[model samples]
Target chain A: VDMSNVVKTYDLQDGSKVHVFKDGKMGMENKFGKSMNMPEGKVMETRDGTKIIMKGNEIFRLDEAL
Target chain B: VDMSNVVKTYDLQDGSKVHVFKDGKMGMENKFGKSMNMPEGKVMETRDGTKIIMKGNEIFRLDEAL
Candidate 1:
């Protein structure tokens, strides 16, 4: 399965980046090196409030080493 | 100012990839292409409860041209 491209990108103050697609879905990276998923019915307000996300936000962590 | 590296990578079902960097931040791509910032106090859930986003989720959208 190929995830579509990003509709927008966010650069945070903590030196972090957030990618959002046209589907209104965003993506994140985990340097911790692990595969995880979000809990059910979990909704969070994007610090900016422009987008609110829920389950399926947390995916697999792929490091540059890979 | 570098946005650093990704702490984790999330691939959404909509074919949209969300790249989350360390410091709890994320990066995204915008096919539409535009330079814009998130509204003040704008909070958005990362779809996955694992991470909740707020103001700064939607950053400038840089297309392939960049």
Candidate 2:
């Protein structure tokens, strides 16, 4: 049988939302409450361990609620 | 042996290949069955769970064929 194949799997993430700061070292509360800044770069880590990297020149700053 | 700065390494990967997605959001089935998408971000996970991140924007998508 020559049928098509499509495998759909559910992930721990209900989709994902991220913020990028390529506009230099500026602080802004993301659409979420996670305030972030990048003087060298921006890195984001999810509660489930997903890591995000931002582009351009800057510092590393991730402000969490702790 | 005077190899203090070098540690023996090599177990897997065995010179594996990679697919780099740049120069526009073009999607092609990698020679190794790995598909990558850009415009959002690039995230990679190694066999032993090593995580890698790529810069710049757009969407997120990945698929491993059967």
Candidate 3:
């Protein structure tokens, strides 16, 4: 439950907060609403071999920050 | 974030509540705390072909209840 190690939290330009996690798990808390669990997407590889993909609001890597 | 479709909620005999979801995503809200996002574990197959595994406090199936 403590996903601080794998989940990265970000403050969007629109004042929204988003968490990008592994396995395509994304949490979005915006001014319009509260928390929602997003589905994971296709896992792709970055140029540096980092696994990454875009889910609901932002791009997430397997083990690193966006 | 509306995981009601893929996530199944259960009230345990001990008064704890859990949400089991696909991709090994599980949420536990015990009497002593709030919500938490659990990590995925070994994908095991049930007799009915359901995927399941135990995370923090309960056993979670990929698409069904414990």
Q: Which predicted model would earn the best TM-score?
A: 3
Of candidates 2 and 1, the better by lDDT: 1
List, residue by residue over A20-56, the lDDT tens digit for candidate 3. Answer: 5665455666646576554344343333443433433
- Would you list the C-alpha lDDT of every candidate in the order shown? 0.37, 0.30, 0.46
**lDDT per residue as tens, model 3, B1-66:** 336544565555444555656654556665565675543443333334434444333453332110
lDDT of candidate 3 at residue A44, scale 0 to 100 = 36
The residue pairs that clash in candidate 3, if any, are A36-B1, A37-B1
Q: Native-contact recovery for every candidate? A: 0.00, 0.00, 0.00
Interface RMSD of each: 11.3, 12.9, 12.4
The segments of candidate 1 whose C-alpha lies over 4 angstroms from its true place after superposition are A1-66, B1-4, B30-66
Question: Could you tell which candidate, 2 or 3, scores higher by DockQ?
Answer: 2
Query: Candidate 3: which docking quality band?
Result: incorrect
Candidate 2: tens digits of C-alpha lDDT, residues B1-66: 122332221111322223333333223233354543322233433345333333443222221210
- Residues B1-66, candidate 1: write the lDDT tens digits: 133676654433333345656665655533343323323332233334322232334322212211
Displacement of residue A24 (Cα, Å) in model 3 is: 44
**What is every candidate's C-alpha DockQ against the true complex, given to 2 decimals?**
0.03, 0.03, 0.02
Q: Tens-digit lDDT track for model 2 on A1-66?
A: 111221221111323333322332234344444544432334454446433344332212121111
Arranged by DockQ with the best first, the candidates are: 1, 2, 3
Best by DockQ: 1
Instruction: For model 2, state the Cα shift of residue A12 in Å.
Output: 33
- Which of the two candidates, 1 or 2, achieves a greater TM-score against the reference? 1
Poorest lDDT segment (10 consecutive residues) of candidate 1 chain B: B57-66
